[PDB]
Amino acid sequence: TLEKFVDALPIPDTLKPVQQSKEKTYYEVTMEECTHQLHRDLPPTRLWGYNGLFPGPTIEVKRNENVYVKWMNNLPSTHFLPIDHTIHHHEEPEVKTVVHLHGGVTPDDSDGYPEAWFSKDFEQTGPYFKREVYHYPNQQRGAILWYHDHAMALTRLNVYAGLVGAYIIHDPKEKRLKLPSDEYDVPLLITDRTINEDGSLFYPSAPENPSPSLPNPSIVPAFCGETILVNGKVWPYLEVEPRKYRFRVINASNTRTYNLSLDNGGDFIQIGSDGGLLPRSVKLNSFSLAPAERYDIIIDFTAYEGESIILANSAGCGGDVNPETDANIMQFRVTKPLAQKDESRKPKYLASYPSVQHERIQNIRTLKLAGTQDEYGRPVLLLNNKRWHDPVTETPKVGTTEIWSIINPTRGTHPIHLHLVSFRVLDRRPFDIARYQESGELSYTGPAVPPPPSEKGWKDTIQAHAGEVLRIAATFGPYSGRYVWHCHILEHEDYDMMRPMDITDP
């Protein structure tokens, strides 16, 4: 049992360029086995880190800044987490990596395609690898992005090992809004972990009470960590000044969804979603945050000087939350003296509505969340009962707008992520699950519900709840090529709830 709120929240340093000109910014990031202490009372933990850090360095760019990152593997040839050899079938290395800039409006060969992996020093490369140095032209709205490993059949492990980091796009136009900035703009990467007494990470090599059918190790369909970390520390505290802060909240956990509140009942102000500023600020007492979602929020500590306020969590993982463990994320202490006047603002009017768009609907895809069961008895989670390797069926035309209607007859929520694009949420609508399973027929049991205000901006990872049809609309561009869409519960993604998405150009 690890005592809460005894370590200061780390704030990862901003990565510095290896070279930089007006025309181009060039970075190098090397994946390394490293060691860091995750809590005061734990021995140091073995981890895989971008530049030896967990989380990796925060990367800061401007809109349209012409960025290059050479992501390099300098990792050991064997993994320290349990590899399931049965889920994926010219011998390949055991350890493979590839970096996805999540939310990036990125050319396809710089997107971190799962089969564009590489081993150490690029010695072996996957069949879709094209380049060492990834290109991020950043021709997109200011927003909270994040970067993480995306390698075929290894994503859950490589991310759990520590390969996650923040990437912020600043649009200079935003600066007139005078949102809290500099030291008052802080990323919060939330990752749940289970840690052994000797400090080493625990990741299960099989489900609990394994049928002796199962290979060993075997993938599991879900992972819930006993402990919550923010920016690489267990249940940390952050000293803040009694003023407005902006927080870039990122769910970088494998499976766990959070439902966040402040334990004094105080409110957040949501200013942004995955795809950038909301049209209007939204005052919220709590919010849901599934894997890979980002909330850009203001918290105003002005009236709370001296207080300790816990960022709390009501969502369970595999059970009800426990008040003494996973009900806690971190603790704010409003005890830092003001370094200057708070000149920041919490404005109402942030940006254009998505509905200012009037694109023609080129196509409507109906998609279902399902799966089968393998030789060993395990669930294999599938998008439209296709395997990753089946020929591509999601094939939007570049420059066109589609509506995707995602049908979820399963028992749980799935956070669905589309690469390249951000999209708008149209509505959700409940249906008869038994009927749909029995007949394939979709019968609605209620009217369509528009998105809550949090989802009236631009999203790239979206919760598809059980027993609902979710509809989204996306314009596919500006690049054509081979991308992916998938569930972002990593245990599902790897087996095998991920499909190719080809954006075609005549």
**Of the ranges 17-25, 70-78, 313-321, 489-497, which one interacts with Cu ion (CB under 5 A)?**
489-497
Q: Output the CA torsion sign for 430, 433, 436, 439.
A: negative
Closest CB to Cu ion among residues 61, 370: 370
| Nearest alpha carbon to residue 476 among 501, 497, 451, 506 | 501
Among positions 288-317, residues that touch Cu ion (CB under 5 A) are: 292
Residue 45, judged by CB atoms within 10 A of its CB (0-12, 13-18, 19+), counts as buried
Residue 429 interacts with Cu ion (CB under 5 A)?
no
Residue 214 interacts with Cu ion (CB under 5 A)?
no
Residue nearest to Cu ion (CB): 487
Residue 256 interacts with Cu ion (CB under 5 A)?
no
Closest CB to Cu ion among residues 102, 424: 102
Closest CB to Cu ion among residues 148, 471: 148
**Of the ranges 37-45, 256-264, 425-433, 481-489, which one interacts with Cu ion (CB under 5 A)?**
481-489
**Of the ranges 12-20, 183-191, 287-295, 309-317, which one interacts with Cu ion (CB under 5 A)?**
287-295
Residue 156 interacts with Cu ion (CB under 5 A)?
no
Closest CB to Cu ion among residues 151, 351: 151
Residue 489 interacts with Cu ion (CB under 5 A)?
yes
Helical spans, DSSP H, in 303-451: 433-439
By CB under 5 A, name the one of 72, 487, 490, 503 that touches Cu ion: 487
**Of the ranges 43-51, 57-65, 160-168, 492-500, which one interacts with Cu ion (CB under 5 A)?**
492-500
By CB under 5 A, name the one of 141, 414, 424, 459 that touches Cu ion: 414
Q: Which long-range contacts (CB under 8 A, 24 or more apart) does 13-19 make?
A: 13/57, 13/58, 14/57, 14/58, 14/59, 14/60, 15/51, 15/56, 15/57, 15/58, 15/59, 15/60
Kindly give, in sequence order, each residue whose CB lies less than 8 Å from that of residue 438, ignoring residues fewer than 6 positions away: none
Q: Is 419 annotated as a binding residue?
A: yes
How much helix, strand and coil, in percent to the nearest 5, is found in the chain? 10, 40, 50
Residue 368 interacts with Cu ion (CB under 5 A)?
no
| Nearest alpha carbon to residue 308 among 209, 390, 382, 237 | 237
By CB under 5 A, name the one of 409, 492, 496, 502 that touches Cu ion: 492
Q: Which SS3 state, helix, strand or coil, does residue 504 take?
A: strand
The torsion region of residue 367 among left (phi > 0), alpha (psi -120 to 50) and beta comes to beta
Among positions 369-398, residues that touch Cu ion (CB under 5 A) are: none
The torsion region of residue 318 among left (phi > 0), alpha (psi -120 to 50) and beta comes to left
Closest CB to Cu ion among residues 414, 424: 414
What DSSP state is assigned to residue 386? Answer: B
Residue 459 interacts with Cu ion (CB under 5 A)?
no
Which residues make beta-bridge pairs with 118? Answer: 97, 125
Q: Which two tokens stand for residue 150?
A: 């995306």
CB 352 within 8 A of CB 279: yes
Closest CB to Cu ion among residues 227, 408: 408
Alpha-carbon gap, residue 277 to 426, rounded angstroms: 18
Among positions 85-104, residues that touch Cu ion (CB under 5 A) are: 102
**Nearest distance from C-beta of residue 57 to Cu ion, angstroms:** 18
Binding-site annotation: residue ranges for Cu cation? 100, 102, 148, 150, 414, 417, 419, 486-488, 492, 497
Binding-site annotation: residue ranges? 100, 102, 148, 150, 414, 417, 419, 486-488, 492, 497
User: What does the binding site for Cu ion look like in residue numbers (CB under 5 A)?
Assistant: 102, 292, 414, 487, 489, 492
